[PDB]
From TrEMBL, chain A:
Name of the protein described by the UniProt record: RING-type E3 ubiquitin transferase
Function: Functions as an E3 ubiquitin ligase.
Superkingdom of source: Eukaryota
Full-sequence portion shown in this chain: 254 to 326 of 661
Domain U-box: 2-73
Organism the protein comes from: Glycine soja
Length: 73, 52
């Protein structure tokens, strides 16, 4: 069960199934960041930096790296 | 440390992260606060300190 932290969501602290990127460059699990924006916050959780967009963009290359790491272990 | 605030962290992940950012800011560490909080919540804070 040796899970690299780069693959963990800063809020869930678990492996990311649907990693998305916000305007600051930080990556989060979609359900987690969606709840954070639903709770009224307009801030990057990790950096407190205020966001310039609400667009969540899937981080496909990370989805690839996680999926590769999943099939090995 | 917040009677019902602490249980709401086993439930809500958003609140739990907010509180984890506060515990980190006051440099509470992994082992200094262990045995003052539940085992599940400790194993989580151990990961939050390591990467946040």
């Amino acid at each position: 069960p040796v899970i690299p932290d780069d693959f963990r969501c800063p809020i869930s602290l678990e492996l990311m199934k649907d990693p998305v990127i916000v305007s600051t460059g930080q990556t989060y699990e979609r359900t987690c960041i969606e709840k954070w924006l639903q709770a009224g916050h307009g801030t990057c959780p990790k950096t407190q930096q205020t966001l310039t967009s609400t667009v969540l963009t899937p981080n496909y290359v990370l989805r690839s790296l996680i999926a590769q790491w999943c099939e090995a272990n | 440390f917040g009677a019902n605030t602490l249980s709401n962290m086993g439930k809500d992940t958003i609140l739990r992260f907010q509180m984890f950012t506060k515990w980190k800011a006051n440099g509470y560490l992994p082992k200094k606060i262990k045995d003052d909080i539940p085992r599940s919540l400790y194993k989580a804070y151990k990961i939050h300190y390591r990467m946040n």
